[PDB]
Structure 1
């Protein structure tokens, strides 16, 4: 309510509640976290990113986004928990402290604010953005089919009414371009993590082509380690591998774009579960999901620091 220590992390929140949370966190830890507005949504809502930094100019950074697909509520809920955990473990956990003393972490909890608000007021299963385009009565674009990586190719739909519609052209969605511009301007990101649900998978590039990435051997081992770490908590089983070999051919995905930009440690997490609840995961699983996911994320971060 009026203190991140009183905030209920075991329940799902609205857009306003999450945004308020950000202000409270920043007010409580001014020396560690700051709120940056990287753009505005199609409908004009501000797009915020939380920057966790210990100092420095343009220290190598880790990017983490959640909620690019509005209906995957477990992701924004995990992002809120992550934000609080960062402030609790710095100075207490030797590994994480080491990470923050040398790198910055950028966390975008609500990557698709228009769609998120829509899931709360009209359609709980909305997945796309909220932009409208003349030649169609259908609304929205699949933000994770809109990136400049094999755009328009197999793995995305060309019909505006489709849940996987890629849009008119790469980066047409302001929600996507806002991230692209910020990452490009920064120029020093070392890791790029995009979180989704559901399926319990840890994926690496590529999704748009069957071509194997040059760093396949290293990324596969990093994923193997992260999955083992995540499983150690509650025994949750995750599969891992390239997007195209694990799920299916998908074009215009964020991770493929970031990897092609030279950001080697690009991974997408697909959280719980494997279909029993799907997108409607019970609130009682928020904390356990967040706790185990953190172990997998920390593993990737550790590798990035020492590499």
Structure 2
């Protein structure tokens, strides 16, 4: 059962997929599993929908693991999923959110890369699509979005860690989300979960242009980082992607914000470089707990 699932360890693709089914079976009135596409290598791509009813209620999107080696993100996603089912009907604030809004949680946004990190190369980041005119495999799926696609802050070199791919939305892992979010039409928040650096970022990455909602998103981010820090003292920086970390093009929240999804944020979770992508399992639960406080704060602002 999800009560005996080990949240303090890293899991395989199959384990996470089986966890999804267990959670849905345990909480059939709250959680359902949606297949939003198939990966390049034909694996199902799944989103958990948390809902207490209604018809396409205002929604929060959360993607985790788009960069496959960022294992703290999938592990955080699993914890989030369980936490949602525990706190609905117990925590006043979260209960208020789910009574009026739906949450769509994509724990393994890049399943082919995730499988590869378990079977072949722990440090695999990209998708597994094969570039026809190339010995190289995969695209940086967080540089493949139709937001400043192909502009400075991504690489045109197919072997690069930061390769943007041949055209915007070339990667089915990205296009699956784009289609789902567009078809849905009522997303109000869009949160992309990454590691590492301890940053909470709002748009843009591709341009120095200030978003029209900068004052608001900046204060939301300030509040969220304070909430996150309150638990273990984990210090996050916050601001626009381009001012806070680097220019980066073809990114998820730049795309979502340009669709009119106002509360668009990217979290870069622990740490700041000591372990980097190889974050010890002993930090999974503390990371998930503090990150939840930040995420819940954003959801509260979305209302």
TM-score bracket relative to the smaller structure: over 0.9
1:92, distance to aligned residue in structure 2 (A): 0.4
Indicate the residue corresponding to 1:178 in structure 2: 176
Within 5 Å, give how 1:43-82 maps onto structure 2.
Answer: 43-82=41-80
- Deviation, 1:184, is 0.3
- Please state if 1:300 is matched with 2:298: yes
Q: Deviations over 1:10-57 (max 9, x none)?
A: 000000000000000000000000000000000000000000000001
SS in 2 for 1:47: strand
Measure the CA separation in 1 of the matches of 2:215 and 2:83. Answer: 31
TM-score under structure 2 normalisation?
Answer: 1.00
Distance (Å, rounded) in 1 between the aligned partners of 2:124 and 2:283: 21
**Alignment TM-score, normalising by the size of structure 1:** 0.98
Residue 268 of structure 2 aligns to a residue whose secondary structure is strand
Q: Deviations over 1:58-98 (max 9, x none)?
A: 10000000000000000000000000000000000000000
Is 2:265 the partner of 1:267?
yes
| Alpha-carbon shift at residue 130 of structure 1 (Å) | 0.1
- Distance, in Å, in 2 between the alignment partners of 1:83 and 1:250 is 29
Question: Quick one: distance in 1 between partners of 2:84 and 2:56?
Answer: 20
Q: Deviations over 1:128-187 (max 9, x none)?
A: 000002100000000000000000000000010000000000000000000000000000
Whole-Å Cα distance in 1 between the matches of residues 22 and 207 of structure 2? 43
Which of structure 1's runs of 4+ aligned residues deviate more than 6 A? none
SS in 2 for 1:102: coil
Gaps of 5+ in 2: none
Query: Secondary structure of 2:238's match?
Result: strand
Q: Number of aligned residue pairs: give it.
A: 303
Alignment partner for residue 17 of structure 1, among 5, 15, 18? 15
Q: For 1:133 and 1:118, how far apart are their aligned partners in 2?
A: 17
| Alpha-carbon distance in 2 for matches of 1:134, 1:93 | 51
